[PDB]
mmCIF file of C-alpha atoms and ligand atoms in Angstrom:
data_model
loop_
_atom_site.group_PDB
_atom_site.id
_atom_site.type_symbol
_atom_site.label_atom_id
_atom_site.label_comp_id
_atom_site.label_asym_id
_atom_site.label_seq_id
_atom_site.Cartn_x
_atom_site.Cartn_y
_atom_site.Cartn_z
ATOM 1 C CA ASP N 1 -19.260 8.173 26.411
ATOM 2 C CA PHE N 2 -21.395 8.424 23.259
ATOM 3 C CA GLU N 3 -24.691 9.204 25.051
ATOM 4 C CA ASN N 4 -25.538 11.481 22.118
ATOM 5 C CA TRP N 5 -25.068 8.458 19.773
ATOM 6 C CA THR N 6 -27.224 5.608 18.433
ATOM 7 C CA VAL N 7 -26.100 2.012 17.636
ATOM 8 C CA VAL N 8 -27.647 0.853 14.410
ATOM 9 C CA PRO N 9 -27.500 -2.451 12.540
ATOM 10 C CA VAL N 10 -24.557 -2.922 10.208
ATOM 11 C CA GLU N 11 -27.135 -3.577 7.442
ATOM 12 C CA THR N 12 -27.904 0.173 7.384
ATOM 13 C CA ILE N 13 -24.346 0.848 6.207
ATOM 14 C CA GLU N 14 -24.121 0.692 2.390
ATOM 15 C CA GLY N 15 -20.973 -1.076 1.153
ATOM 16 C CA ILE N 16 -20.538 -3.486 4.004
ATOM 17 C CA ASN N 17 -20.800 -7.112 2.916
ATOM 18 C CA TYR N 18 -19.978 -9.960 5.310
ATOM 19 C CA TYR N 19 -19.558 -13.643 4.414
ATOM 20 C CA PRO N 20 -19.244 -16.049 7.341
ATOM 21 C CA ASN N 21 -17.548 -19.385 6.702
ATOM 22 C CA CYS N 22 -16.227 -18.097 3.405
ATOM 23 C CA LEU N 23 -12.923 -19.986 3.614
ATOM 24 C CA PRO N 24 -12.830 -23.720 3.979
ATOM 25 C CA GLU N 25 -10.772 -24.977 6.887
ATOM 26 C CA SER N 26 -8.331 -26.535 4.451
ATOM 27 C CA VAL N 27 -7.607 -23.112 3.002
ATOM 28 C CA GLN N 28 -7.211 -21.516 6.434
ATOM 29 C CA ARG N 29 -4.788 -24.231 7.574
ATOM 30 C CA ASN N 30 -2.738 -24.055 4.373
ATOM 31 C CA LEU N 31 -2.293 -20.302 4.815
ATOM 32 C CA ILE N 32 -1.518 -20.502 8.533
ATOM 33 C CA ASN N 33 1.017 -23.352 7.976
ATOM 34 C CA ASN N 34 2.786 -21.149 5.508
ATOM 35 C CA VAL N 35 3.085 -17.858 7.334
ATOM 36 C CA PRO N 36 6.575 -17.238 8.776
ATOM 37 C CA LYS N 37 6.549 -18.603 12.304
ATOM 38 C CA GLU N 38 7.943 -15.346 13.742
ATOM 39 C CA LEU N 39 4.780 -13.560 12.604
ATOM 40 C CA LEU N 40 2.625 -15.664 14.936
ATOM 41 C CA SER N 41 4.566 -14.927 18.139
ATOM 42 C CA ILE N 42 2.242 -14.944 21.153
ATOM 43 C CA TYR N 43 4.386 -12.420 23.036
ATOM 44 C CA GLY N 44 3.796 -8.699 23.250
ATOM 45 C CA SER N 45 2.119 -6.973 20.354
ATOM 46 C CA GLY N 46 1.082 -8.752 17.168
ATOM 47 C CA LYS N 47 3.431 -8.338 14.227
ATOM 48 C CA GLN N 48 2.486 -7.320 10.706
ATOM 49 C CA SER N 49 3.819 -8.157 7.291
ATOM 50 C CA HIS N 50 3.493 -6.441 3.897
ATOM 51 C CA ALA N 51 3.390 -8.678 0.820
ATOM 52 C CA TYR N 52 3.670 -7.621 -2.871
ATOM 53 C CA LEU N 53 2.765 -9.613 -5.978
ATOM 54 C CA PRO N 54 3.526 -12.164 -7.167
ATOM 55 C CA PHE N 55 1.935 -13.828 -4.120
ATOM 56 C CA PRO N 56 2.518 -17.488 -3.322
ATOM 57 C CA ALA N 57 -0.316 -19.875 -3.757
ATOM 58 C CA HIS N 58 -1.347 -20.041 -0.035
ATOM 59 C CA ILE N 59 -2.093 -16.285 -0.203
ATOM 60 C CA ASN N 60 -2.975 -15.878 -3.812
ATOM 61 C CA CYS N 61 -5.822 -18.335 -3.630
ATOM 62 C CA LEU N 62 -7.686 -15.891 -1.363
ATOM 63 C CA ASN N 63 -8.365 -13.841 -4.533
ATOM 64 C CA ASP N 64 -10.613 -16.730 -5.626
ATOM 65 C CA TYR N 65 -12.952 -16.350 -2.650
ATOM 66 C CA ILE N 66 -13.578 -12.618 -3.246
ATOM 67 C CA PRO N 67 -16.930 -12.478 -5.093
ATOM 68 C CA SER N 68 -16.578 -11.753 -8.824
ATOM 69 C CA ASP N 69 -19.323 -9.105 -8.810
ATOM 70 C CA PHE N 70 -17.214 -7.078 -6.295
ATOM 71 C CA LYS N 71 -13.986 -7.379 -8.301
ATOM 72 C CA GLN N 72 -15.708 -6.461 -11.610
ATOM 73 C CA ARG N 73 -17.519 -3.499 -10.106
ATOM 74 C CA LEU N 74 -14.536 -2.012 -8.253
ATOM 75 C CA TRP N 75 -11.270 -3.693 -9.211
ATOM 76 C CA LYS N 76 -11.808 -3.867 -13.020
ATOM 77 C CA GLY N 77 -12.431 -7.606 -12.761
ATOM 78 C CA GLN N 78 -8.825 -7.927 -11.609
ATOM 79 C CA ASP N 79 -7.231 -9.308 -8.412
ATOM 80 C CA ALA N 80 -5.675 -7.644 -5.373
ATOM 81 C CA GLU N 81 -2.343 -5.803 -5.743
ATOM 82 C CA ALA N 82 -1.391 -5.014 -2.153
ATOM 83 C CA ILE N 83 -1.758 -7.265 0.836
ATOM 84 C CA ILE N 84 -1.152 -6.723 4.556
ATOM 85 C CA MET N 85 -1.183 -9.533 7.138
ATOM 86 C CA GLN N 86 -1.623 -8.387 10.707
ATOM 87 C CA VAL N 87 -1.538 -10.367 13.940
ATOM 88 C CA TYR N 88 -3.588 -9.330 16.978
ATOM 89 C CA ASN N 89 -2.637 -10.826 20.330
ATOM 90 C CA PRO N 90 -5.182 -10.346 23.100
ATOM 91 C CA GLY N 91 -5.487 -6.634 23.842
ATOM 92 C CA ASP N 92 -4.348 -5.579 20.339
ATOM 93 C CA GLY N 93 -6.558 -3.392 18.183
ATOM 94 C CA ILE N 94 -6.537 -0.500 15.796
ATOM 95 C CA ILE N 95 -7.767 3.042 16.322
ATOM 96 C CA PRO N 96 -10.712 4.328 14.284
ATOM 97 C CA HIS N 97 -9.663 5.190 10.749
ATOM 98 C CA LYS N 98 -10.622 5.303 7.078
ATOM 99 C CA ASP N 99 -8.242 3.410 4.777
ATOM 100 C CA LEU N 100 -5.784 5.642 2.867
ATOM 101 C CA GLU N 101 -6.934 7.249 -0.372
ATOM 102 C CA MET N 102 -3.984 5.652 -2.187
ATOM 103 C CA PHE N 103 -6.118 2.453 -2.225
ATOM 104 C CA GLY N 104 -9.414 3.654 -3.735
ATOM 105 C CA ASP N 105 -12.599 1.676 -3.399
ATOM 106 C CA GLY N 106 -13.161 -1.890 -2.239
ATOM 107 C CA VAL N 107 -11.251 -3.437 0.639
ATOM 108 C CA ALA N 108 -11.324 -7.176 1.417
ATOM 109 C CA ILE N 109 -10.549 -8.543 4.875
ATOM 110 C CA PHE N 110 -10.094 -12.220 5.557
ATOM 111 C CA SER N 111 -10.073 -13.326 9.184
ATOM 112 C CA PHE N 112 -8.095 -16.269 10.684
ATOM 113 C CA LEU N 113 -7.499 -18.083 13.992
ATOM 114 C CA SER N 114 -10.175 -16.504 16.156
ATOM 115 C CA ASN N 115 -13.026 -14.070 16.357
ATOM 116 C CA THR N 116 -13.045 -10.377 17.071
ATOM 117 C CA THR N 117 -15.298 -7.335 17.014
ATOM 118 C CA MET N 118 -15.008 -4.389 14.625
ATOM 119 C CA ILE N 119 -16.760 -1.112 15.312
ATOM 120 C CA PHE N 120 -17.884 1.450 12.770
ATOM 121 C CA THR N 121 -18.189 5.103 13.697
ATOM 122 C CA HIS N 122 -19.856 8.058 11.930
ATOM 123 C CA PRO N 123 -19.089 11.249 13.922
ATOM 124 C CA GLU N 124 -21.282 13.542 11.788
ATOM 125 C CA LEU N 125 -24.286 11.129 12.029
ATOM 126 C CA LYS N 126 -23.408 10.251 15.655
ATOM 127 C CA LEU N 127 -23.824 6.567 14.873
ATOM 128 C CA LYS N 128 -22.000 3.398 15.894
ATOM 129 C CA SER N 129 -22.376 -0.098 14.472
ATOM 130 C CA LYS N 130 -20.577 -3.311 15.275
ATOM 131 C CA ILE N 131 -19.821 -6.539 13.535
ATOM 132 C CA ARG N 132 -18.372 -9.750 14.840
ATOM 133 C CA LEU N 133 -15.576 -10.827 12.443
ATOM 134 C CA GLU N 134 -15.398 -14.581 12.778
ATOM 135 C CA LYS N 135 -12.637 -17.001 11.904
ATOM 136 C CA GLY N 136 -12.851 -17.865 8.207
ATOM 137 C CA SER N 137 -15.005 -14.864 7.266
ATOM 138 C CA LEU N 138 -14.643 -12.298 4.558
ATOM 139 C CA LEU N 139 -15.537 -8.635 4.992
ATOM 140 C CA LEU N 140 -15.889 -6.375 2.001
ATOM 141 C CA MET N 141 -15.855 -2.641 2.650
ATOM 142 C CA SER N 142 -16.691 -0.198 -0.157
ATOM 143 C CA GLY N 143 -18.642 2.989 -0.997
ATOM 144 C CA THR N 144 -20.317 4.587 2.038
ATOM 145 C CA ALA N 145 -18.719 2.073 4.466
ATOM 146 C CA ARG N 146 -15.266 2.806 3.104
ATOM 147 C CA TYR N 147 -15.414 6.619 2.683
ATOM 148 C CA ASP N 148 -18.192 7.868 5.002
ATOM 149 C CA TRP N 149 -17.491 5.737 8.128
ATOM 150 C CA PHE N 150 -14.468 5.011 10.355
ATOM 151 C CA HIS N 151 -13.580 1.462 11.428
ATOM 152 C CA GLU N 152 -11.569 0.224 14.415
ATOM 153 C CA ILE N 153 -10.875 -2.860 16.523
ATOM 154 C CA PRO N 154 -11.174 -1.970 20.200
ATOM 155 C CA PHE N 155 -8.058 -2.500 22.306
ATOM 156 C CA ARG N 156 -9.299 -5.079 24.808
ATOM 157 C CA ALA N 157 -8.914 -8.722 25.785
ATOM 158 C CA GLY N 158 -12.489 -9.870 25.334
ATOM 159 C CA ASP N 159 -15.792 -8.859 23.832
ATOM 160 C CA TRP N 160 -19.299 -9.138 25.134
ATOM 161 C CA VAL N 161 -21.129 -11.368 22.702
ATOM 162 C CA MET N 162 -24.856 -12.027 22.682
ATOM 163 C CA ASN N 163 -25.903 -15.502 21.679
ATOM 164 C CA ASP N 164 -29.032 -17.516 22.269
ATOM 165 C CA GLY N 165 -30.441 -14.810 24.594
ATOM 166 C CA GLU N 166 -27.376 -14.755 26.840
ATOM 167 C CA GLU N 167 -24.467 -12.357 26.928
ATOM 168 C CA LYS N 168 -20.941 -13.543 27.784
ATOM 169 C CA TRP N 169 -17.512 -12.028 27.783
ATOM 170 C CA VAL N 170 -15.592 -14.014 25.219
ATOM 171 C CA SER N 171 -11.893 -13.808 25.779
ATOM 172 C CA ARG N 172 -9.826 -12.963 22.717
ATOM 173 C CA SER N 173 -7.263 -15.305 21.253
ATOM 174 C CA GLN N 174 -4.564 -14.571 18.726
ATOM 175 C CA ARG N 175 -6.072 -13.388 15.444
ATOM 176 C CA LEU N 176 -4.619 -12.928 12.020
ATOM 177 C CA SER N 177 -6.158 -10.784 9.317
ATOM 178 C CA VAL N 178 -5.304 -10.572 5.649
ATOM 179 C CA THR N 179 -6.280 -7.273 4.051
ATOM 180 C CA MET N 180 -6.454 -7.139 0.262
ATOM 181 C CA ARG N 181 -6.642 -3.929 -1.718
ATOM 182 C CA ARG N 182 -5.741 -2.290 -4.998
ATOM 183 C CA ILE N 183 -3.581 0.779 -5.556
ATOM 184 C CA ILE N 184 -5.459 3.391 -7.529
HETATM 185 O O1 AKG B 201 -7.096 -6.394 10.435
HETATM 186 C C1 AKG B 201 -8.257 -5.949 10.396
HETATM 187 O O2 AKG B 201 -9.253 -6.666 10.643
HETATM 188 C C2 AKG B 201 -8.455 -4.466 10.064
HETATM 189 C C3 AKG B 201 -7.214 -3.944 9.329
HETATM 190 C C4 AKG B 201 -7.441 -2.534 8.866
HETATM 191 O O3 AKG B 201 -8.429 -1.954 9.288
HETATM 192 C C5 AKG B 201 -6.508 -1.894 7.912
HETATM 193 O O4 AKG B 201 -5.618 -2.588 7.367
HETATM 194 O O5 AKG B 201 -6.629 -0.669 7.641
HETATM 195 FE FE1 FE B 202 -8.673 -0.234 7.823
#
């Protein structure tokens, strides 16, 4: 598949900003301790959970780790209004998509528990790009990244990851994302 396509660096995609080790461990633990225990079930397919403001502190504090320059530029200096928490047990993913127009520009994703791989697709350009979303990271998607490209998480139970010159198949563990957006 995709023999007509090129894989380019994620840096070539305007409006993708990635911040490894954005959340202190203390913040990650406080959030995870405070999610309903049913949400983190290891069995079958990961569950999801919509939350609407006012958010409790263990969520709401995530607003503080979204860079101010992003919120000013796109969110009117304000904080997130809609939040979705999604669990991914090994083998879970999401098909390529662009986020719904009801949200307008600037999407923040916080990652918890374990690492995964997200793939960006531009069918008109015939390009792919990939980013490793690590535990504790923040991904901001806006502009070209958010309107021009699709994103997905492949449905599989590991990812090939290149590190220190070697490539290994890193098994997936349970992963939780928190996606923070505004309604336009
Ligand atoms: O959970 C993720 O990392 C991606 C979620 C997503 O793409 C979405 O909420 O539209
Ligand atoms: Fe999305």
